[PDB]
DNA sequence: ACCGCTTAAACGCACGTA
DNA sequence: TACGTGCGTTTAAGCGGT
């Protein structure tokens, strides 16, 4: 039976998702998360649809960029695998 | 009348985080990344939403608008185009 | 009788805020309950939102 | 907010190897 | 030795109506 070697399909996915623009997190859980977080700041809140979509576009753009920097940190350490310490270095240097 | 308390962050699933990382150009991913990512996401969301709601409250509204979010993002140096 | 502040934790007050209330010296839901907002706010690491959540959930419990 | 149906994605596991 | 790949199962996201 056929099996691709470790890495081939990963690269295929990179090309695939860098080619496209669709949101990568599921709508409903993201919305649920947003409402949960919002509740600890202000009671009785409602949300415009486009407000939740705005938050998702912003969040996903942020995470993708962070993963770019994280990847650079992993490669810097002569690895190809990203690890929490890569994220933490990236966020420290960003001033986060 | 009642509506129940909930916990959500785990709804941002492993394959979703993987897709985000792929778009970020990542080829291989440690198992510990996912939880880490979730924490990071939560912090981000919290900050933005905290500001957004502040704007909402100033306008004496109960509905967070797209503009509330846009202003929060702008004032955090993360300008977003497309939702004005 | 008493309502130990532990039960407040199931209402969804985070456990760190309950530890801050015990450090302040509040050990029961009775203790948080019959106090105004400002008592909990003056405690280190407690915002006005957490104090409102505590009083509301304590009024649910008490 | 809810009901129902569908199906594709998630998940658990086995295994080999990078 | 931990992670990628593949496969069978199950779970829930998605879509459509109201």
Author numbering:
A (entry chain E): 38 to 133
B (entry chain F): 18 to 101
C (entry chain L): 21 to 82
Authors' description from the paper:
RAD51 is the central eukaryotic recombinase required for meiotic recombination and mitotic repair of double-strand DNA breaks (DSBs). Here we report the cryo-electron microscopy structures of human RAD51–nucleosome complexes, in which RAD51 forms ring and filament conformations. We found that RAD51 forms multiple conformations in the complex with the nucleosome, such as ring forms with eight (octameric), nine (nonameric) or ten (decameric) protomers, and a filament form. Notably, we found that in all RAD51–nucleosome complexes, the NLDs of RAD51 directly bind to the DNA wrapped in the nucleosome.
In a decameric RAD51 ring without the bound linker DNA, in addition to its nucleosomal DNA binding, an NLD of a RAD51 protomer in the RAD51 ring may also contact an N-terminal tail of histone H4. The H4 N-terminal tail extends toward a RAD51 NLD, and the H4 Lys16, Arg17, His18 and Arg19 residues are located close to the NLD. The interactions between the RAD51 NLD and the H4 tail may not be observed in the RAD51 rings bound to the linker DNA. To determine whether the H4 N-terminal tail region functions in the RAD51 ring–nucleosome interaction, we prepared nucleosome lacking the N-terminal residues 1–19 of H4 (H4 taillessΔ19), and performed the RAD51 binding assay in the presence of ADP. We found that the band that corresponds to the decameric RAD51 ring in complex with the nucleosome without the bound linker DNA was specifically decreased with the taillessΔ19 H4 nucleosome. To ascertain whether the basic Lys16, Arg17, His18 and Arg19 residues near the RAD51 NLD in the cryo-EM structure contribute to the decameric RAD51 ring–nucleosome binding, we prepared nucleosome lacking the N-terminal residues 1–15 of H4 (H4 taillessΔ15), and performed the RAD51 binding assay. As anticipated, RAD51 efficiently binds to the H4 taillessΔ15 nucleosome as well as to the wild-type nucleosome. These results support our conclusion that the H4 N-terminal tail directly binds to an NLD of the RAD51 decameric ring.
